[PDB]
Structure formats: structure tokens, C-alpha cells
Design a protein around this ligand. Sequence first.
Ligand SMILES: CN(C)C(=O)c1cccc(-c2cccc(-n3ncc(C(=O)O)c3[C@@H]3C[C@H]3c3cn(C)nn3)c2)c1
Ligand SMILES: [Cl-]
Length: 289
Amino acid sequence: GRLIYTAGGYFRQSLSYLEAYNPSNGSWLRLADLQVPRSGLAGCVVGGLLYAVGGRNNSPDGNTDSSALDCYNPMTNQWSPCASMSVPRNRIGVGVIDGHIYAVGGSHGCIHHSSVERYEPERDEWHLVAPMLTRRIGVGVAVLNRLLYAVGGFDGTNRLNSAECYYPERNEWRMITPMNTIRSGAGVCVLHNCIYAAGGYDGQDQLNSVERYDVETETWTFVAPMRHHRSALGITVHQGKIYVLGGYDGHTFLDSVECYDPDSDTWSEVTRMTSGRSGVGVAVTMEPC
Ligand SMILES: CN(C)C(=O)c1cccc(-c2cccc(-n3ncc(C(=O)O)c3[C@@H]3C[C@H]3c3cn(C)nn3)c2)c1
Ligand SMILES: [Cl-]
């Protein structure tokens, strides 16, 4: 059985929580805390290991953007440090291609990154690759057909409807069709042949709208909106369904988890996180121990 892991996030300050939700039975487990609290981080999995990438420790004692990569082994319930990235990356996006982790965009103070770098677990090494054509923080990232997509975000001046694609064998970024909606701090993931962008912030309002990019047709289409408006949501895919976790609706730090069924085109309430939070990192792997 596979669990949805939620790492870090933010309520009043950055959080070190790691909890796992089991869609088979509705249960949550609290597991080993992150060594350093962090929000605006991303989660991913490689070789059954869970990686926590970037973010920022918002704390009474000071605010520190994170260049960290940390690894969680469900067998041991332990976090281990890995090599750090070239630069701190708050409000990061991440994607995995052929066992390598791409860290995309994010901020370091008022620096809004276009830079992109790639982690090789077998060497414990990061290396920079071609930078994006756009500076993007709060960027959505997904992998489809071993191509890496950077969707939306904030460029230091505007929230973006734009999106682009990285072609590894050419070390080259190219723009794709822009989204119909400006989305910064959205949830972005892949399901079947489409990149989904759920929620985010458009410069005025947190969004409940959801749209998907079909690579074969190069168009974005709206699907059913989520029940909750949300920015800074976590998102993942588990057994052919999209799950969205937490975020911010202009009023509340949400504990809502919703899931999307693409065949009925419907969203439904699935569970509540143990406490409301925004800016989490999420991924799916095997259950611990
Ligand atoms: C309200 N609060 C501060 C938190 O809940 C929060 C706390 C810690 C980390 C994040 C976070 C995580 C990922 C992306 C972004 N992000 N990246 C870019 C922009 C933008 O604003 O363009 C944003 C923020 C989410 C959107 C936002 C802004 N507003 C007013 N609502 N949502 C933030 C949000
Ligand atoms: Cl922040």
C-alpha cells in the first residue's frame, strides 16, 4: 500500500511535520519531523525514497530560505541530509525524470530564479542545467513523457499564465501554450496525458478553477473546479486520482483534502489533515516499516 506523504508547510510559522495519509483506510500517521522546519518546499520520490527540496524556514528567530535536499527512508523512519543545491529556492517546483530530480525556479530573498538544477542520487551531486526563459517562483512543475514543464508562478513583477517545457536531450526550454488563467502557487501534476493546474493566486483572488494541458493538442481545457478556493496547495496523484491538500483561501489555512475523479469530472472531500496549513510538499511512496 502506498501513502500520501505531506511534509512541512505553514501556519503562523513554518512547520516540520511529516504525516502520511492512507487512502485505503482514511488514517493518518505522524512520522519523523523534518530536521529543519520549512514551507514553500516540494516533495518527490525516487527509488522509494522521499525527498524534501528547498522552501523557507519562517520562524520567530529569523527567516531563512533553504537550499537543502533531505531524504526520508520509510524503512527506517529517518531523515538524512543530501548535498545542497547551488542556491536557496523558496516556493520551488520539482520534477523527477529517469531517477534525477529537477529543482526549478523559486526565490532567494528578492531574487526570483529562472535557474534550474538537477540532482543525481547515485553521485549525491547537483548540476545546473539551462535556465528557464522566465523567472518563476511559486512555479508548478510536472513531468509527462520524460519532458519537464514549468507552469505559471511569479516573476518578481507579475503573476504568470505562461508556461514552458524543458527538452533534456537539447538542454533547452521552449514556451508552450499559456494557460487560460493566471496562476501563482497552484498545484500542478500529471494524470494520463494531461498536465493539470489546480488553484493558485491570480493577483487578486485564490482560485478554485482547474485546467489541463493536453500535449497532443497543445490546448488547455477547464475541468470541474475544486470545492475550495486555494493557493499554496499540495498536490499529488494516487491510483489515477488527483489529491489536493491544504492551502490558503484568503481567510483560513485549509485542512481540506479533495480528490478529483477524471471519469465523473467531480471533486469530493476525502479527509482532513490533522491541522490546517499551506505551502506543503507532497509525494507518494510505500508505507513505513
Ligand atoms: C498566506 N501565506 C503567506 C501562505 O499561505 C503561505 C505561507 C508560506 C508559503 C506560501 C507559498 C507556497 C508556495 C507558493 C507561494 N506563492 N508563490 C508565489 C505567490 C504569489 O503570491 O504570486 C505565492 C502565494 C500563494 C500566493 C498567494 C498570495 N495571496 C495573497 N494568496 N495566495 C506561496 C504561502
Ligand atoms: Cl514564504
